Amino acid sequence: SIERLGYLGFAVKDVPAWDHFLTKSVGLMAAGSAGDAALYRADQRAWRIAVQPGELDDLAYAGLEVDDAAALERMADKLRQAGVAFTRGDEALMQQRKVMGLLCLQDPFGLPLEIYYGPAEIFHEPFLPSAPVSGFVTGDQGIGAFVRCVPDTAKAMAFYTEVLGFVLSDIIDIQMGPETSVPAHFLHCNGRHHTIALAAFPIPKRIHHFMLQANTIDDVGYAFDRLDAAGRITSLLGRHTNDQTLSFYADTPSPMIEVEFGWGPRTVDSSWTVARHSRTAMWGHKSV
Amino acid sequence: SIERLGYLGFAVKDVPAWDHFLTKSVGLMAAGSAGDAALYRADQRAWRIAVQPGELDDLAYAGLEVDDAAALERMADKLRQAGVAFTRGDEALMQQRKVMGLLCLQDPFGLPLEIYYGPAEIFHEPFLPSAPVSGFVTGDQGIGAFVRCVPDTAKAMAFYTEVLGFVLSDIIDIQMGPETSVPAHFLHCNGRHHTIALAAFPIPKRIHHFMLQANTIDDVGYAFDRLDAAGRITSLLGRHTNDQTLSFYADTPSPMIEVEFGWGPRTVDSSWTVARHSRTAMWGHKSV
Amino acid sequence: SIERLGYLGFAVKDVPAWDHFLTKSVGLMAAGSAGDAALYRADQRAWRIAVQPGELDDLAYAGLEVDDAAALERMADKLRQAGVAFTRGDEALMQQRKVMGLLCLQDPFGLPLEIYYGPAEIFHEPFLPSAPVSGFVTGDQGIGAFVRCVPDTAKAMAFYTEVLGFVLSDIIDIQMGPETSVPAHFLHCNGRHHTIALAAFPIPKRIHHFMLQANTIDDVGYAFDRLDAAGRITSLLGRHTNDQTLSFYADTPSPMIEVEFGWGPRTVDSSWTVARHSRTAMWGHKSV
Amino acid sequence: SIERLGYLGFAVKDVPAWDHFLTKSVGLMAAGSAGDAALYRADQRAWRIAVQPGELDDLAYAGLEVDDAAALERMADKLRQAGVAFTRGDEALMQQRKVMGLLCLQDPFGLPLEIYYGPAEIFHEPFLPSAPVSGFVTGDQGIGAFVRCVPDTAKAMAFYTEVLGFVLSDIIDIQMGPETSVPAHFLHCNGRHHTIALAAFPIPKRIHHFMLQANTIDDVGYAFDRLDAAGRITSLLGRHTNDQTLSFYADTPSPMIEVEFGWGPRTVDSSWTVARHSRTAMWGHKSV
Amino acid sequence: SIERLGYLGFAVKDVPAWDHFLTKSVGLMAAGSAGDAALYRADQRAWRIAVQPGELDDLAYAGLEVDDAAALERMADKLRQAGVAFTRGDEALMQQRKVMGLLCLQDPFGLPLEIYYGPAEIFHEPFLPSAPVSGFVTGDQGIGAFVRCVPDTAKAMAFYTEVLGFVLSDIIDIQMGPETSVPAHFLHCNGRHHTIALAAFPIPKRIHHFMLQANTIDDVGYAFDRLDAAGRITSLLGRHTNDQTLSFYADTPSPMIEVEFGWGPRTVDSSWTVARHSRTAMWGHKSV
Amino acid sequence: SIERLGYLGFAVKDVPAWDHFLTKSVGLMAAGSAGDAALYRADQRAWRIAVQPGELDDLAYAGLEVDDAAALERMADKLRQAGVAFTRGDEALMQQRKVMGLLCLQDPFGLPLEIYYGPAEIFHEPFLPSAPVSGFVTGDQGIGAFVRCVPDTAKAMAFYTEVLGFVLSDIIDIQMGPETSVPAHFLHCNGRHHTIALAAFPIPKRIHHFMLQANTIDDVGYAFDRLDAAGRITSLLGRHTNDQTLSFYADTPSPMIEVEFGWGPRTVDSSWTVARHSRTAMWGHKSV
Amino acid sequence: SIERLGYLGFAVKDVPAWDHFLTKSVGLMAAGSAGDAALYRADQRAWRIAVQPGELDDLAYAGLEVDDAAALERMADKLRQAGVAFTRGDEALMQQRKVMGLLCLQDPFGLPLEIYYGPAEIFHEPFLPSAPVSGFVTGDQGIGAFVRCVPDTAKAMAFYTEVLGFVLSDIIDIQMGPETSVPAHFLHCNGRHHTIALAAFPIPKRIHHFMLQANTIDDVGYAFDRLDAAGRITSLLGRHTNDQTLSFYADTPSPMIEVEFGWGPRTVDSSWTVARHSRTAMWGHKSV
C-alpha cells in the first residue's frame, strides 16, 4: 500500500503569482527548476511542490510514495490484479521527478497519480524558508494532504482503499444548503489523520484545497497575517472536529483552489475508530 | 471482536429522578432527546446514556462498538456461524442511536445488545458537566462497565468470550452467606480491566450496577458527598482487589440497580494473568 | 508591596446582561450575592468579580491582595508616609467583601482601590463553569489584569510603582492616528507579565478592558465562538508582542469596556528587561 | 526559630492499649524503652513517640527541633528576651530523650515543650512497620502535627509566632453549634502546611488530635480498616479544605484524644497566602 | 509455553529453622499453613514458598505458571505429544496449592513440576515483611529463579526448551578444578534473565540454590548482615557476569542448598544474544 | 552592574562585503538602516549589529545593556564616583540606536561604550535568517562576546570589574612564541561564560574577534562550509578549554578582525571557580 | 538473517604500527593474542578486531553474528538453498575466534565471511581504553561498519540482501570525476544505519574503510587531534548526508584502507525509506 503523499504538481495560468504565493506568503524555499516546472521545497527533499504553466489552473499530478523497489513492484501487481491501467515512467520522467522508479496512472476520475520510490534528498543544501516559518511537519507523514473532489464518493472510496491501501479515518457531513450536506470521507495511509479526503463538492476543480502543517502555532499566526496582507484569507483561524488541525484557509492564485495552513492535529494508528461529525469546525473557521 | 462498551439505555419508572441523578449527582451533561429517550453525555460523543420511560426499571440495551464497517460484517459472520439470531437495525434505529450501522441481538438471557460502528461526535458542543467533575475516563476504553446478572455463568461466559471476543481477566469469590459464595467473572475487551462482569446473583435485575470512571480522586470524593446529600450511598469509599478501582457505590432511582463512581484502576493487556480473589475489596467498601 | 490583583467590582446599567455575559459567554460560575452585588467565581475563591447596579457602567473598585495582617499594616505605613489618604474598611465592608482586613483608598485619578488580606475560600463548593472552559489561570498571579486609563501616565506610574510596589515590565507605543501614539506602560507585581497597564487613552472609562487567562488554546477558541454568537467580538484572534498572550477581545455590556480572553503568555521575574515595542500584536488581533 | 516537631510523649492510663494501637493499628515500630517510657519509631530516628503511664491520659510533652547547638542558644536568647521561663535539660534528661541539648519550658497554657538539637538516628536498625504501611512522610517536615486546645487563641498565637517563630498558614471557622464557630489557626514552621494548629475548643485535653502522614493513599485505606476492626473510627475518609490532607480520624485509647492518619496534602513556603475557610472538609470526613 | 516460576515447595528436616530463616533473615511474611505445609509470602500471592517436614531436605516441587485455562490445556497437549507422563491435580491438590487447575509431572531427573493457572491473590491482607526489606521484584517475572542440578545438561535442555518452552539466555563455564569446568545453561521464559539454570554439578541435591530479587541495594546490604549474624554467609557481595544480579549467597538450613539474595540485574527479551562467559562473577562473590 | 552585551557597531571600508558576510555567510537578517548604518538582526531585537562606512575597519562602539531606568542612573553614579567621564546620549542618538536612554563613555584605551536601557523589539517582524541557521543563543546572555585587545590587562581589568561590574571567569595563557605567552582574562556579567575577554595581543585592532553562538552543531558545521566557500576560514573546527564552545574562526572583511561561530559552551554563575588553562583548545582549532 | 557485524580480522605488513594505531590513536584495549593474531577490544567482548601478519595489508575476514545455534543452522540452510559453498569451522577455529559455532564462506568477490553464534564475553576484565575515549557504541548494533569494494554492485547486492538478509537503507551517488559517479549502496541488518556499504570503487583493497562509533562528540574531537599528531588525517570533521554520522577519516597503516571515527548518527528500522543523495557530506569532510 501507499506509504505517504510525497509531492504535488500544479499547472497554472500565473506562474509568477504562484511563485510569490509559495515563497513570500507560505514560506517554502525556491529550489530552481526541472524542465518547465519551478520547484519548491519544505524540507530535505530536493522538491515537494512543482508549478508549471498551463490552462488547467489545477493539480496536475500527485506523487504517492512507497519505501523501496520491491514495494513498487507489489503496487504494480495490485494495479494489474485490479485492472487499473498504468505505465512505467521512462528515464526522462524519472529524471524530471528525481525518483528511482515510478508508475503512472489515474484515479477513476482523471487525476494523474504517480507511485514512486527513491526520491532525492539534498542535506548539503539545508532548508531555508522564504518567509518566517520555523518548519513543516513532514517526515513519514509526507508533505501534507489534499481534498479530492469526486462525482461518486463510493466509487472513489473503493479505489483509494481497495487498490491503493488507504484507510478510512472518519466522515464529516458538510452542510451545503438548508437541506443539503456532503459526506466528506477522510483517508489515512500513515500517522497523518488524513492524506486524502474524498467529497462530492460542486466545484469544477480536481481538489478543493491542499494542506501544509507547520511546527508551531505562531507559524500559523504569522502566516495568517502574511496571507491577509495579500488579500487571500478565506477563513478565520479555527480548529477541525476530526483531525483537530488548528488552521486558516486562503486562496491560491488558481480560482477555487485554496490552501489550508495548520498546526497541532491528532495523529492516528490501527486503533482509530471510524466516527461521524456534523460540522467541520470544533471552533472558528468562520468563512470570510 | 467487540472493541468497547459505547452506550447504555435504561427504561425507568421515574424519568425526572434519573435526570436529576445523572446530571446534578453524577455530573453528566444533559444532551436533549431522541424519540422518547432523554440523552446524557460524558465526553465528545453525541450521547452515552439514554433514559426512556418504562416499567422495567432496568437496563434496556447495551451498545457494543467496533471500529469500522468491515468489522461489523465480521461480527455478523461470527453471529451466523454461532447460530445467534440477529437483525440489522433499520434506518429509524440508526437515526435514533446516531450510528452508521448496527446489529440487534440478545445475550443468552435476554439482554438486548446492539453491535455498532460509526457513532456521532459533536466537538463543536464541548462537554460541560452538570456537577463538579473534571471529566471521565472513556476514549478507547468506552463509557465504563457493568455487572451482568446471569443464571448460568458458564453459559454466559461461552457467549461473551467465544462469540463476542471478550477475555477473562480474573475471578472474585463473592461471599453471600456463611457458606455461600458467587464466582464473579470479570471480562475485558480493551485496556479497561473489565467492561462486563458475569455473576449469578439472586437479584431480579439484568445488572447489579454500572461503573463510571472519573479523572481524579477528588472527583470521586466530591461525588460521594453529592450522593450522600441525596440519601443514596450504599458503600463507603473503598478499593477493589482485582481492578483496584477506588470507588463508592450508590443507588440509582431504579430499585436494586446501583452506580459505582470510581478512580485509578489498573489496566490490562495480553499479558494479564487469570487469578482468583477471595474478597471484592482490598480496603473499604463497607456496606451501609 | 501588593502581591496580586484579587477581585474586581463593576457598577453597571444592565445587571442581567452582565450576568449572562460572565456566565454563558465567559464561563464564570454564578456564586449568589452579597448585598446588592451579584457574585461570580473563577476558582476556589468565594468570589472574584462583583456586579452591582449603577449608572457608572464602569469598574467601581479593584481589590489588591497582600499575604497577611502584618503586610497590610506595612501598606498602611507606606500610604501614610506617601501622604495618600485611606480609611480602614469597617466590619460591614469586611463582611461584604469576605476579607479579614482592608484599606480603602483611590489612585490619583479616582479609581477606588481596596488593599486586603485574608480572603474566603470555599473548596467544599468546587468550581463549576457556566460554559465550556477547562479553568482559569489564577493562583499566585491573581484573577487577571486590567488596562487603566489615565490622564498623566508619569503621575500614575509614580503612584503604582513607588507607593504600591508594582514594577515596570515594558512599554508598547500604541499608534492611534497617523502621527499619534500612546505609550502604554505594563506593570507587574508577581509572575503575571502585567497586572495593571497604564495608558493615556481618550476614552471616558476608568479602564479599557480587563483580561482573564484560560488554561488551554481550545478554551479561547470555544469562547471566541460563544462571544461571536452574542455579536460581541471586537478583535480577531491574535497574540501580543510583549506578554505573548494569545487572545481575542469582545465588548462587555458596558459601552467602551471590553474583555480580553487569552492563553499562553510569558511570565516574568526579577530578570525581566524593560523593552519597547512598536505594535500591540506580534500577529492577528485585527479590529472588527 | 523552631525548624520542626520532632517527637511527642504521652502519659496514659492504658499503656498496653496504646502499645497495640501504635503498632498493630497505626503501624509504628516498637523500639524498646527509655526509663518508664515505651518508645515507637516511624523512620530512622531512635524514637518519635513515647508512651509512659500516668493519669493525664494526654500529651505530656512535645519536642521542638532546631538544626544545631548555636540555633539552640539563639532560642535560649529569644526565651530570655521574651521573659519566658526555661531550664536546661540535665544529663539524665538528655540521655532519656537521646538528644545533645535541650531547653525545657511550657507554652502559656501549661503544655511542656522541649526545644532540642542533635537527635539520635539508628540506620543500622532500619525501620520495620508493625502493620502494613509503606512508610511515613517525615524528614525536614518532622513527625507530623497536632491541634493544641487553648483558652485564648490570640495569646497562644503571639507566643507560637513571636517567640517560637511559627507562621500563620490559614484559618478555618469550625462551626460548633447553630450560631457558634471556633476560629482554628494553622501554623507552619517548615514545608508542612501546619505543625501546630491553635483552637479554643471546649475539650478538657491539651490536644484535640495528632496527625501522621503516610506515603500512599492505600496506606490510609488499609489503616482505616484496621482501626475500624478495632472499633475506633470517628470520621469517614475525607479531605481538608486548607492543607488538603486526605485522611480519616480515629480515637486513641485516651478519651477525647484522636489520631488523624492521612496522605497527599499541599505543602507551603514563603509565598503562602493567609486565607479563611468556612468548613474543615472539602469533601468527606462525615462524623461517625 | 511456561510464563513464569510461581512457587516453590521444600521438604525439610528442621521446619522451625526454615521458618526463622525465611522470616527473620530473608524477610518473607508468614502466611499460615495448608495441610502440613507452612506458607510464606513475598507479595500479593496467597503464598510463594511452602515448607513441609521431610527427610529430603530439598526442593520437593516447583510451580510453573501459565496465564489461563486454555494455556494449561495447550501445555497438556504439548506433554502428550512429547510422551511426557502427567496427571491432573485433583480437587484436594488444587485446594492445597490454591490454584484453579494443575498438571503434575516430573522433569527427566525426578524433580516434580506442577504446571498451573489461576493462583489466589489476597490484596485485603497486604504484604508485611518479617524483616526490613522494602519488597521483592516478582510480578510477571515470577517469584525468582533456581539452579537445577542435572546429570545430563543436553537431556535437561531438550526438555526445558522443547517441551516447556524455556529459552537459552547464555552459558557460563564454571571452573571447578584445575582442568575441570561445568557449563551452566541459563534459561528464561519471561523478562527475568533466567528462571531456571541447568548445570551438571556434583552435588547430591536437586538444586544448588534458589534466588530472590529485592527492590533496593540496601535491602541486599541489610540482608547480608542479618544472614551474617546467623552465621550463614557463603559468599561476599558480588555481581554476576551474565545477569548482573548484585547479590550474596547464604546457606539455608538444608545442607548444600543455598539462597542468593540480589538486586539490579539486566532483563531480557527476544533480542537477547546467546553468549559465553568464563567466570560467574564480574566482581566480588568471593567464597567464604 | 552591566547585565549583558546587547549590540555592536562596526566602521568599515567595504560595506557591501560586510553586508554579504553577515547575511549570506553568517546568516543574520538584514534589517534596513538607521542613518548611514546598515542594520542586522539575530533575534527579536530591532537590531544587533550595525555597519557604517569608515576607515577604522574596526569595532566603533559596543552597547552594554541594563534592565531599567534606575539601573542606568546607578551606572551613572558609579561612573561619577570612579571619575570616569561620560555624556548622556541626546535624542538623536537615542533615536539612532533605538533605546530609551544611554550613557556614552570610553574604556581606558579608547573603545567607545554605550550603556543603555529600553531597547526596541519587533516581534511583528519575526526573525528570518539569510542563510541556513536555526537561530542564535541570545536572550539574557546578550548578542555574544568579543575579545578586547589592550596594552595593559591589569588596568583594563580594574575598569571592567570595579567600574562596570564584570567578573573574572578564568585565564588562558596563550602561547605566542617559543618563550612568550599572553594571559587572556575572560570576564562574565551573566550566564555566558564570558562576554568580554581582555588580552595584550600585538594586533593593531580594538578587538581580535567577536563571537556568535548558534543553536545546533549543524548550524556550525553548515556555516563552516559557507565561510570556506568564501575563502575566509582561519581555524578548523575545535573546542575551547575554558568555555567549551565548539567553534571555528573566519576572517571578517576587515583585516585582522575575525568572527568565531560556535555552539554548546558551559555557562556560569556565582559558583564559577577561577582557574588557569595553558591552551586555548581542548581539541581542534588548528590554524589554517 | 545476519543480526550484526561482530568482528574484523586484518592481515597486515606492519603489526606494530597497527598495534599503536588501534591502541594509542583509536583507543582500543589491547587484549593479548590468539595464535599469531593480536587482539583488540572495544567493549565486553573478548575481542573485536584481530591483527595478524600478512602481505595482504587488507581485511582478511569479517564475523557476522546470529543470536543462537538454531539461527546458525537456518543460515546454513539458506546457504545450501542458494548454492553458496561453506564449511563448518572446526574446533581449532572455534577456539581461535572464541565462538560456539561458525560457518566459513566467501562473498561473491572473495571476502571471507564467518557466520557465528555464541561469542565470549569477559565482564570480569572490564574495558579500559588505551587513549581517552569514553566508550564505543556497539551492543545490538555490532562493532561498527565497513565499506566493501566490489566490481559489480548488483551482484553483491543480491548476495547480501537475498542470501544474508541485509536490507537497503539508501544510496549516495559519489562523484569521482567530472562526469563519473559511483552509486554506493548502504545496507543495514539492525538499528545501525548501515553495517555494510557496497560500492564499485577503483581501489585495489577489499574495503575502502571501517567505521567505529564513539559515545561523545568530544571523543571524536580528541581522536582527531591524536590522528593528526600521527600525520594520518585524510578528512576534516564532517557529517554524512545519509546516516548523519559526524566523523573524520584517517589512514590506517595499510595503504588505501582508512578508518572513520564518528558520533551521533540516525538509526533505522522497518520504516526507513529508500532515498538517494547526491553528496556524501551534508557538511564538512573536506579531503586533505
Swiss-Prot record, chains A, B, C, D, E, F, G:
Fe cation binds at A145, H209, E260. InterPro entries: DiOHbiphenyl_dOase, Glyas_Bleomycin-R_OHBP_Dase, Glyas_Fos-R_dOase_dom, VOC, Xdiol_ring_cleave_dOase_1/2. Its EC number is 1.13.11.39. Pathway: Xenobiotic degradation; biphenyl degradation; 2-hydroxy-2,4-pentadienoate and benzoate from biphenyl: step 3/4. Pfam families: BphC_D1, Glyoxalase. It catalyses: biphenyl-2,3-diol + O2 = 2-hydroxy-6-oxo-6-phenylhexa-2,4-dienoate + H(+). Its cofactor is Fe(2+). GO terms for molecular function: biphenyl-2,3-diol 1,2-dioxygenase activity; ferrous iron binding. Homooctamer. This is Biphenyl-2,3-diol 1,2-dioxygenase. The lineage of its organism: Bacteria, Pseudomonadati, Pseudomonadota.
